[PDB]
């Protein structure tokens, strides 16, 4: 058995369950790496989890996700939530806490709701 954690990432209707397992750093979307995505301009928004805490961070793990539902904007917003949540879930269980506190501080300071999904509940005032 390998060290592995699994989480999820949710947009309005998009569902993306992550599989953060050990390895050498493969990061794939349903069969495919990141640099092929098309939207192709929203590639930089899912580039962001590589970037806000330092690039390297991945030589001991492997990433595989899959998406069911949503739209092309909604699908990319689903996974990039799940990457940052899936990253710290490994630091939740194997790595020490204070490293993860340094990760979430780098995350929350720039946070575009990377750690929380959108829910809309209206009310008249």
């Amino acid at each position: 058995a390998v060290p592995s954690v699994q989480t999820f990432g949710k947009k309005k209707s998009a569902t993306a369950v992550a599989h953060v397992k050990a390895g050498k750093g493969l990061i794939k979307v349903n069969g495919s790496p990141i640099t092929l995505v098309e939207p192709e301009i929203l590639r930089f928004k899912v580039y962001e989890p590589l970037l806000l805490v330092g690039l390297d961070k991945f030589s001991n793990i492997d990433i595989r996700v899959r998406v069911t539902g949503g739209g092309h904007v909604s699908q990319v917003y689903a996974i990039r939530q799940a990457i940052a949540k899936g990253l710290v879930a490994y630091h939740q269980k194997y790595v020490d806490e204070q490293s993860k506190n340094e990760l979430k501080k780098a995350f929350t300071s720039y946070d575009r709701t990377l750690l929380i999904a959108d829910s809309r509940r209206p009310e008249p005032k």
Binding site: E97, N101, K104, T108, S109, L115
Partner: protein, 86 residues
Amino acid sequence: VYSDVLALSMRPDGKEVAVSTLKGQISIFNIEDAKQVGNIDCRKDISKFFTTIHYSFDGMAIVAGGNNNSICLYDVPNEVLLKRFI
């Protein structure tokens, strides 16, 4: 993001607000909901409690209380001031 909250704490300036999480983590944030700190769970076996919290009047500290027979001390930065065990 997480955490059904029992214990809430406010600044008397209307800017800083601390929340006790659904565990021993203690997170604080601004009025622009940007999380400053989240404090590690409660130790001290004689399971987690976050029952009471207070923002100090000088504005430079907070005091945290659960029910595991001590009390915890913190400042506006990340760190623990003291931990006094009964």
